Structures are given as C-alpha cells and as structure tokens.
Design an enzyme around this catalytic site. Structure first.
Site, PDB file in Angstrom:
ATOM      1  N   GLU A 117      11.866  34.387 -44.501  1.00 25.01           N
ATOM      2  CA  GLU A 117      12.924  33.520 -43.983  1.00 25.01           C
ATOM      3  C   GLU A 117      14.249  33.870 -44.635  1.00 25.01           C
ATOM      4  O   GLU A 117      14.654  33.248 -45.624  1.00 25.01           O
ATOM      5  CB  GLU A 117      12.572  32.041 -44.195  1.00 25.01           C
ATOM      6  CG  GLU A 117      11.616  31.536 -43.095  1.00 25.01           C
ATOM      7  CD  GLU A 117      11.171  30.090 -43.266  1.00 25.01           C
ATOM      8  OE1 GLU A 117      11.559  29.455 -44.272  1.00 25.01           O
ATOM      9  OE2 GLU A 117      10.450  29.577 -42.358  1.00 25.01           O
TER      10      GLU A 117
ATOM     11  N   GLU B 150       5.207  31.427 -38.625  1.00 32.86           N
ATOM     12  CA  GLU B 150       5.084  30.193 -39.390  1.00 32.86           C
ATOM     13  C   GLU B 150       5.570  29.029 -38.542  1.00 32.86           C
ATOM     14  O   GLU B 150       6.697  29.066 -38.037  1.00 32.86           O
ATOM     15  CB  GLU B 150       5.894  30.269 -40.683  1.00 32.86           C
ATOM     16  CG  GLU B 150       5.508  29.208 -41.727  1.00 32.86           C
ATOM     17  CD  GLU B 150       6.549  29.106 -42.836  1.00 32.86           C
ATOM     18  OE1 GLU B 150       6.617  30.064 -43.627  1.00 32.86           O
ATOM     19  OE2 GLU B 150       7.311  28.100 -42.906  1.00 32.86           O
TER      20      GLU B 150
END
Length: 306
Positions: free
Chosen positions: A136, A224
């Site tokens: 991320e 995710e």
C-alpha cells in the site's frame, strides 16, 4: 490439486488466466503481520483453509517497517514456510512486501531487490508463486514518479530469474488509485495492479474505478479487502460486502480477505482462543470469519481444462 489443474498463471488483456489461457479467479485469505501473528501461518492452518473454506490462494504479509523484515529479517522464514506449505498443498501463494508506514516503496527498494532476488531464486520455477512488490503506497506518493519507477527497478530483477510468474503492483492512496496506473501502465508482461477496499468505507466510486481501469486493458487484483471500515475495526458491513463480492465475482477479479488473526477487531477472522493450527468450529470464527468462509465458494466456477 488446484495448481496441478491450472498451472502457470498469465495475464491476457485485462484478465488473469491459467496455463491454457482461460480466465480464472483466485480467492483466499491474507495473514496479518508475520512479525506479529506468525503462529497462524503454518501448514496445518493453510491446509484447513484449503479443505474447509476452499481457498485457492494464500497471502503472506511480510511487513517491511514496524518491527518487520528490515529490523528483523528472520521473518523471512515465515514467508518460506508459507510458500513451501502452498506448494505442498497445490494452492497459489502471494509473497507480499508489505509496506505501510514506509509509504514510499523507494525507501527500501534496495532491500526489496535483494529479497525478491532470493525468493525467485528459491521458487521462481514453481507456478504457485505470485509477487506483490509494494502492498500500500500511501501519502504524497504517486504512480508516475514514485510507484512506477520503483516497479521498473524491481521487476527486471524478478524477471531476470523468474520470467513468467505474476507481479502485483500496489497503487497510490493505499492501493486505491488504479486509474493513474491504468493511464500509464507498465510495459512488462504478466503484471497486475492492486485495488484494496473496505466495505465500511469504500463504495460505488471505487467499484467504478475497477471498470475504468479494466476498460483501458489493465488487470486488477484485489489483494486485500475487509468487511470492516478501512481502519480494520468499526463493525462488520456484510450487506456492502455482498455487493462488492458479487461485483468482483461477475468480473472474474481475484480477491483475498484481511486477515487471519485473533486480534480483537472487526476484520479479524478468528476469535481469541482459536487454534493457531486450524480446525476451527463456528464458535471459533468471528462474524467476519463466518461470512468470508461462506463467501469463499459462493458462485465459484473455475475453468475446465480443454
């Protein structure tokens, strides 16, 4: 033997495909941080997720910062354990260079090259392995001048050993900005761009971004997502989770739930006291866990080989 059926994965157009060029969707579970909850990552728990839930991919979240790999490199052993379990069990495995607090992937880019060079040397000939080179990206970190240049340094190192396995590349704003990536895509083959969502936070606007990105030819992997809000807590949003999973299932987009741990938060799959080695009854699963097990094989029809 799911990997024995579908073998080497590859990207054709905007779609992940199996060894026969048939569109295929993966579904599964992510570990939490391997430096914090390693006890739930083992051959026993992964086999149980395969047999009882029906996962076809497992994600090993190796944090780089926050007491992870950079400061304690022995966490690498948990990645090796997860990968060797999935090869033994015939499911796919994501090796996740899980940046977060280190929001710019270039911060530890030299260590990422060395780490992925060893993983590909060990496992690059197995079709099970998927590389996720930066979980991320976040902060003042952008596709055109931070993430894409990072990827153009790491992927040639992977591809110098492992010519064909999938690389998932994270996007800006905690892997939300797939539209930047789609408007300026990597030149390499067999690459996909990560989209992360949380049902308590992200709605129709982000779903539209998937359609925009795929329409430009970019392949999207949901590596995710959670039933909670984006903090990982805040309750469980099962109605919203249903719309998201139906949308992804409709488009054959692969997805991996967060997370396999007993941490006392809405997105955690397990209640405190759930065994580290699988075999969980319904009382042992949290509301999120019970929902994700139910969703794992809903409307799941992988291709039949020619």
């Amino acid at each position: 033997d799911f990997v024995g059926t579908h073998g080497q994965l590859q990207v054709i157009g905007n779609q992940l495909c199996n060894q026969y060029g048939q569109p295929i969707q993966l579904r599964g579970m992510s570990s939490h941080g391997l430096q914090w909850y390693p006890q739930f990552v083992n051959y026993d728990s992964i086999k149980w997720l395969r047999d009882d839930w029906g996962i076809t991919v497992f994600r090993a979240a190796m944090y780089t910062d926050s007491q992870g790999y950079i400061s304690n490199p022995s966490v690498k052993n948990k990645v090796i354990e997860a990968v060797e379990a999935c090869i033994a069990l015939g499911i796919y495995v994501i090796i996740d260079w899980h940046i977060l607090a280190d929001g710019n992937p270039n911060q530890y880019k030299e260590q990422a090259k060395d780490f992925f060079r060893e993983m590909a040397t060990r496992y690059g000939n197995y079709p099970n392995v998927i590389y996720e080179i930066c979980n991320e990206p976040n902060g003042p970190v952008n596709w055109n001048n931070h993430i894409k240049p990072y990827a153009e340094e790491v992927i040639p190192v992977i591809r110098s050993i492992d010519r064909n396995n999938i690389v998932i590349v994270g996007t800006g704003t905690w892997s939300q900005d797939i539209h930047d990536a789609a408007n300026n895509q990597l030149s390499f083959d067999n690459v996909m761009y990560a989209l992360h969502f949380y049902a308590g936070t992200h709605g129709q606007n982000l779903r539209s971004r998937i359609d925009y990105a795929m329409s430009r030819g970019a392949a999207i992997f949901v590596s995710e997502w959670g039933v909670s809000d984006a903090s990982g807590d805040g309750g469980v949003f099962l109605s919203q989770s249903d719309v998201w999973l139906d949308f992804l299932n409709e488009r054959n987009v692969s997805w991996v739930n967060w997370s396999l741990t007993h941490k006392v938060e809405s997105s955690a799959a397990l209640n405190p006291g759930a065994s580290p080695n699988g075999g969980w009854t319904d009382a042992n699963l949290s509301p999120s866990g019970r929902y994700v097990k139910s969703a794992m094989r809903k409307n799941y029809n992988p291709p039949v080989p020619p």
